[PDB]
Amino acid sequence: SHMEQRILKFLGKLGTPKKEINRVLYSLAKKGKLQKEAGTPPLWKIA
Amino acid sequence: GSHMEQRILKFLEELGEGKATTAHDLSGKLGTPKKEINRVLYSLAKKGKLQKEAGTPPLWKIA
Amino acid sequence: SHMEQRILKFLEELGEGKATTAHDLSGKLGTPKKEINRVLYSLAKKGKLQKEAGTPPLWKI
Amino acid sequence: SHMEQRILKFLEELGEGKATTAHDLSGKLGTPKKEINRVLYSLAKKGKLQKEAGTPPLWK
DNA sequence: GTCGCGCGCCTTAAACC
DNA sequence: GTTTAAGGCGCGCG
């Protein structure tokens, strides 16, 4: 995946397409390689 | 990860290099209903851990 | 079906230019999306309907 | 609305076991899940129902 | 502001017992 | 006459 990598580099709302971004986020959480601790905003990091 | 993913991951691994099976087959050989089997397979898929050849029915092997 | 031709005439009605989403196709016709997609996907079986994938998928002839 | 109250009526009235799936509520009432689920997840945030988990979720 | 959503899924017909 | 179907479906989304 091209656009997944990009997000990883950084390390939660980011200024490139933000709809397409959340898909790729929850993917890598479900998918792994990211943590999702709840609350608003949803917080994100590498595990 | 999960017990069920464990079992499924066992069976597919043991079939061979590039050997693929169906939710139906799995369902029978593991004694779990197809619905559960599919639930997990599609998960493992979204998890990068497996590969779906699409068709009727889809074929499942390791990526 | 009553809805099938209606779904058709709406796609058909708005040129060959482009497809639309089931969502709006619903909202304009006042019919729920469930009924809409049922039919779209039903029709795409047959050759007339033509599905262009995505999220959300786009529907043209 | 009309639907909230009926659904709202259904749970306690038919409190056999505890709770039922959006699906069942639909089939009884002859109404698609969209309207039903809207109303259930609505009635949750504010307090009058509990989502006991599963697939589909169960509401009491 | 949480939103990831793609969803059609049987008011089921084709298909394997 | 059960089981399949992409059938996995959880969906509520404004």
PDB file of N, CA, C and O in Angstrom, chain B residues 40-52 60:
ATOM      1  N   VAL B  40     -14.143 -14.586  10.352  1.00  0.00           N
ATOM      2  CA  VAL B  40     -12.709 -14.572  10.663  1.00  0.00           C
ATOM      3  C   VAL B  40     -11.837 -14.438   9.415  1.00  0.00           C
ATOM      4  O   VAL B  40     -10.892 -13.651   9.400  1.00  0.00           O
ATOM      5  N   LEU B  41     -12.137 -15.210   8.379  1.00  0.00           N
ATOM      6  CA  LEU B  41     -11.327 -15.179   7.159  1.00  0.00           C
ATOM      7  C   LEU B  41     -11.277 -13.768   6.618  1.00  0.00           C
ATOM      8  O   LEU B  41     -10.218 -13.236   6.341  1.00  0.00           O
ATOM      9  N   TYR B  42     -12.431 -13.141   6.533  1.00  0.00           N
ATOM     10  CA  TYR B  42     -12.485 -11.792   6.023  1.00  0.00           C
ATOM     11  C   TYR B  42     -11.729 -10.792   6.925  1.00  0.00           C
ATOM     12  O   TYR B  42     -11.142  -9.821   6.444  1.00  0.00           O
ATOM     13  N   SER B  43     -11.739 -11.057   8.226  1.00  0.00           N
ATOM     14  CA  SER B  43     -10.911 -10.319   9.154  1.00  0.00           C
ATOM     15  C   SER B  43      -9.425 -10.489   8.815  1.00  0.00           C
ATOM     16  O   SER B  43      -8.758  -9.523   8.426  1.00  0.00           O
ATOM     17  N   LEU B  44      -8.933 -11.728   8.900  1.00  0.00           N
ATOM     18  CA  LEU B  44      -7.522 -12.042   8.621  1.00  0.00           C
ATOM     19  C   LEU B  44      -7.070 -11.420   7.309  1.00  0.00           C
ATOM     20  O   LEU B  44      -5.953 -10.923   7.201  1.00  0.00           O
ATOM     21  N   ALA B  45      -7.971 -11.425   6.334  1.00  0.00           N
ATOM     22  CA  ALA B  45      -7.781 -10.764   5.054  1.00  0.00           C
ATOM     23  C   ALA B  45      -7.512  -9.261   5.200  1.00  0.00           C
ATOM     24  O   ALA B  45      -6.476  -8.774   4.774  1.00  0.00           O
ATOM     25  N   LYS B  46      -8.454  -8.536   5.806  1.00  0.00           N
ATOM     26  CA  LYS B  46      -8.270  -7.119   6.115  1.00  0.00           C
ATOM     27  C   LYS B  46      -7.000  -6.894   6.959  1.00  0.00           C
ATOM     28  O   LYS B  46      -6.390  -5.823   6.869  1.00  0.00           O
ATOM     29  N   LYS B  47      -6.611  -7.910   7.748  1.00  0.00           N
ATOM     30  CA  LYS B  47      -5.350  -7.911   8.495  1.00  0.00           C
ATOM     31  C   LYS B  47      -4.067  -8.230   7.687  1.00  0.00           C
ATOM     32  O   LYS B  47      -3.031  -8.499   8.299  1.00  0.00           O
ATOM     33  N   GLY B  48      -4.111  -8.230   6.348  1.00  0.00           N
ATOM     34  CA  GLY B  48      -2.979  -8.704   5.524  1.00  0.00           C
ATOM     35  C   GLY B  48      -2.510 -10.177   5.653  1.00  0.00           C
ATOM     36  O   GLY B  48      -1.729 -10.667   4.822  1.00  0.00           O
ATOM     37  N   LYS B  49      -2.976 -10.896   6.672  1.00  0.00           N
ATOM     38  CA  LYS B  49      -2.490 -12.248   6.981  1.00  0.00           C
ATOM     39  C   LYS B  49      -2.864 -13.361   5.993  1.00  0.00           C
ATOM     40  O   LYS B  49      -2.235 -14.421   6.017  1.00  0.00           O
ATOM     41  N   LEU B  50      -3.885 -13.145   5.162  1.00  0.00           N
ATOM     42  CA  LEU B  50      -4.338 -14.148   4.176  1.00  0.00           C
ATOM     43  C   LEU B  50      -4.719 -13.517   2.845  1.00  0.00           C
ATOM     44  O   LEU B  50      -4.797 -12.288   2.707  1.00  0.00           O
ATOM     45  N   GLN B  51      -4.984 -14.392   1.872  1.00  0.00           N
ATOM     46  CA  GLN B  51      -5.289 -14.011   0.494  1.00  0.00           C
ATOM     47  C   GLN B  51      -6.566 -14.682  -0.028  1.00  0.00           C
ATOM     48  O   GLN B  51      -6.740 -15.898   0.103  1.00  0.00           O
ATOM     49  N   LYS B  52      -7.431 -13.864  -0.625  1.00  0.00           N
ATOM     50  CA  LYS B  52      -8.715 -14.285  -1.195  1.00  0.00           C
ATOM     51  C   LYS B  52      -8.627 -14.194  -2.718  1.00  0.00           C
ATOM     52  O   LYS B  52      -8.506 -13.095  -3.275  1.00  0.00           O
ATOM     53  N   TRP B  60      -9.119 -19.343  -0.280  1.00  0.00           N
ATOM     54  CA  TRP B  60      -8.323 -18.740   0.775  1.00  0.00           C
ATOM     55  C   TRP B  60      -6.996 -19.422   1.011  1.00  0.00           C
ATOM     56  O   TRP B  60      -6.970 -20.594   1.397  1.00  0.00           O
TER      57      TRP B  60
END
